[PDB]
Write a protein that binds this ligand. Sequence first.
Ligand SMILES: NCCCC[C@H](N)C(=O)OP(=O)(O)OC[C@H]1O[C@@H](n2cnc3c(N)ncnc32)[C@H](O)[C@@H]1O
Ligand SMILES: NCCCC[C@H](N)C(=O)OP(=O)(O)OC[C@H]1O[C@@H](n2cnc3c(N)ncnc32)[C@H](O)[C@@H]1O
Ligand SMILES: [Mg+2]
Ligand SMILES: [Mg+2]
Ligand SMILES: [Mg+2]
Ligand SMILES: [Mg+2]
Lengths: 485, 485
Amino acid sequence: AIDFNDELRNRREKLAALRQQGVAFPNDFRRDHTSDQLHEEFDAKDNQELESLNIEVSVAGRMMTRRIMGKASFVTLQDVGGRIQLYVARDSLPEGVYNDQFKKWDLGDIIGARGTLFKTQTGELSIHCTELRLLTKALRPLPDQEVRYRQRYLDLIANDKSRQTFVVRSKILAAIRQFMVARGFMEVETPMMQVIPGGASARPFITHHNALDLDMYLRIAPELYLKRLVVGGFERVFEINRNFRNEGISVRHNPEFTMMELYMAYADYHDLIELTESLFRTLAQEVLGTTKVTYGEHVFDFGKPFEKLTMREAIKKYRPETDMADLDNFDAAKALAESIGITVEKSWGLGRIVTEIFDEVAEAHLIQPTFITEYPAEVSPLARRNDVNPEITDRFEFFIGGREIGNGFSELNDAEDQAERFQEQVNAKAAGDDEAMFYDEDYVTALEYGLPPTAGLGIGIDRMIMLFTNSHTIRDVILFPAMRP
Amino acid sequence: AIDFNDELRNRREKLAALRQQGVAFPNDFRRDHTSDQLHEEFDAKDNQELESLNIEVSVAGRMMTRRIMGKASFVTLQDVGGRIQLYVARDSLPEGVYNDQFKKWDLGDIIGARGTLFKTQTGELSIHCTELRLLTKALRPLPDQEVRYRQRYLDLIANDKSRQTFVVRSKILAAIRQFMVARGFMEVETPMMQVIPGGASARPFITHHNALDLDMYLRIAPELYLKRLVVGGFERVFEINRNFRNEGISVRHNPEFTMMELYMAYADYHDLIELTESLFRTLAQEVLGTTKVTYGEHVFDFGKPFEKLTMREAIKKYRPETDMADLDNFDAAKALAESIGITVEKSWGLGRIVTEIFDEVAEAHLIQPTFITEYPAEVSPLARRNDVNPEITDRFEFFIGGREIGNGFSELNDAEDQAERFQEQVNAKAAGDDEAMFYDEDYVTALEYGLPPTAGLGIGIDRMIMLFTNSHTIRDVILFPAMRP
Ligand SMILES: NCCCC[C@H](N)C(=O)OP(=O)(O)OC[C@H]1O[C@@H](n2cnc3c(N)ncnc32)[C@H](O)[C@@H]1O
Ligand SMILES: NCCCC[C@H](N)C(=O)OP(=O)(O)OC[C@H]1O[C@@H](n2cnc3c(N)ncnc32)[C@H](O)[C@@H]1O
Ligand SMILES: [Mg+2]
Ligand SMILES: [Mg+2]
Ligand SMILES: [Mg+2]
Ligand SMILES: [Mg+2]
């Protein structure tokens, strides 16, 4: 109870003393190795080899553990690469350092050491220090379960599993880029501030540009800009960045999240299906070392094709007692939708009701990688219309672990059609749909100049990261998740 | 005048006819080569070689030019890789395609072709088409000078110099990542929505999260979060992404811009100076093929060290008649500052006035790569204090072409100091400074756990891109610059 305040007081007092000696917070010590480097290169060498090699190195990091055994101590130093042992002895360090300094430091203190590599009796790689310094005094001792999110640095200091998750996140993003670039895609940066937000259906965040006394929105999706670039000739473009949606936080939703949108001209959604499957197989193989990924109580084989069902097949499969004819009648569908708990809004049409039914009925059940095709036109204002059935579009979404991971389709490059669909979206917003799209005249204009047949795909990067790190909340894969005040 | 409307009407009529024949906008044609690929691989081969090689390829792109010479025509097809010639002959294509289709198409129309490679009499690489299709009908004919920005797709279709600039932008970003990763830096993604914006001095954009009924700000800088990660153990982190500042548009300012922030523990600003110099030399060499870069009427030698001056030396050098003692007296400095047109705000202190003087006096003159050191503490709330002179911090900024390209310093890891500086910033905001920082208690807390000595650097990526593409307005290096309504 009070022992914590004694720790705080003790640290402030030790700092006070440092301040009296000179500059309390230096910036002079330089290391030449991180723990991981030392282990990779020297773990396989026995004390004999290391003795003759007589290799001196310099490291720096947090003092995680310290066992003072008189004239000698053993310390665990933790740096960006992991942990390495330090052998701190009174007679190995400059006169007085051991007793007048080292013993006065505290766990959590950032220290720097220079010494010779050797292996302990236990066979561990250790550094027999010849120099040791206190670089940063930690004023607080080393660390609900929401603390991990409110103070992610504490979580990173304490849990190696958490660190590994974020390190893997970086590996995945770098691997996606390498994968995309390998396919001739060029990464671009489109606006995140837009006067007319679009490219998706979501409530946007609105802000105001004082200089132009202009109200603007954080983008909910870069889609409309990326397709403008395809019209401009950048036929293989992709963007991996934030998108913002003024919607509530959840185990799969963060107000700001990372999405990858990619567009390749002269391709349709089938090409995107192949790309998605190869992307996941590549990432699993590349990042995890295997195509079979364990997630919760499941195992996803990214080495086998994703399952593929039309939206209706998924509805029928997960609610077998459904009279499929009900999805063809607005009243029947509205009734069905309502019977299962969906509040049917005045603005919704049959296509929207059917999609909502699909959401309620099947989504949570798509545990194994699944592609859901034949999305109704009503809910796909930017998707190419299907040649045989105008009421649906050449669009799909894919799910893994019961969550939507991506959304892709053959793009709508029919300007007149696009204009009309934007009008419907405007009507819908007038009819109450707060997520309906804004009319984007310049976008239509761009299509009038000619957009090559194209296939676009958006993938929720955070959700994707969850599947590769066995995380069951988006909060575990975003360094600083949105937290409630 | 009316000729444009005749073009529009003609295109709509041709489309109408396509609609009558079936699906006007297909998505079926697939290419296997882009123009650049064909040129790289076959430009060096004469018609003899190509004849015997009898290589068939498929391309797709915009019909830029068409010369109908009776039973044969010559077309310039432009795709993501550039341009390639098409030899379109009546008897080389399926019956009727040439006359009933090809001749009816219009420049700007997206077409696809499949044919054998050969070289024209002029020695140009061309494709003797055997199949040719209209993929997308262009309803508008091929394209103030602000149009390039309002309809960047038109600019990209029309000007290859503009395309090359953006292609180079992508190359530069990819090269920065490769450079950073080569140095063990890990790329992270920190929030772009923050309840307490910080890390810089700027008027932020504010928005509202309905779900949490919480007012939030678009980040002006990720600095405070990146340093939290360093405390957490990610000792070499960097982020390259948007930052938003509610400030006016300029030839060097966009409300949203790309900045790279990097932090490496156990390093000081001198280490950042080396990193910056190597980064520019590497990028020039790597991306431009030479370390000497032509920019406007100048040539920057990124193969030679940047010039380095303290802020005062730059002031003295560019306003030689300045009595340097004036910078040591608030009243004298205020007078000096005002005498040169700077409106000195009530909140400003000596350090701020001196910095403003430097800005007015020297900034525009730093044409050749220059590092400006010794920034006053008052204007550097997050920078490590200098050991000898507490009134200045171990901070620098670097300029090229008379514009600030980067800002870096040894980081302030003295929690108590940081808290006090935040208080001063709060006082300043209370005294009228609309750009002063907010107090960030959690940030201070993070520092209390111990931030290793660190050196951080922020570089304006867009401004950097300008120097490598001879662009003289930021508007030329951002695909969709903020435009006035
Ligand atoms: N032209 C083809 C379509 C391209 C993508 C489309 N413009 C688009 O925006 O498509 P959406 O489906 O809107 O979103 C894409 C994916 O983003 C994830 N996602 C969406 N909201 C999210 C949130 N709040 N938190 C975390 N992740 C979230 C999902 O994986 C989604 O599939
Ligand atoms: N701890 C070390 C400091 C790290 C960087 C610091 N947090 C930072 O934010 O530092 P600033 O200096 O605020 O901005 C960095 C660079 O951004 C560019 N810039 C700033 N505003 C811009 C605008 N409106 N348009 C385009 N570019 C702009 C500049 O190159 C600047 O140097
Ligand atoms: Mg959603
Ligand atoms: Mg969706
Ligand atoms: Mg500025
Ligand atoms: Mg600055």
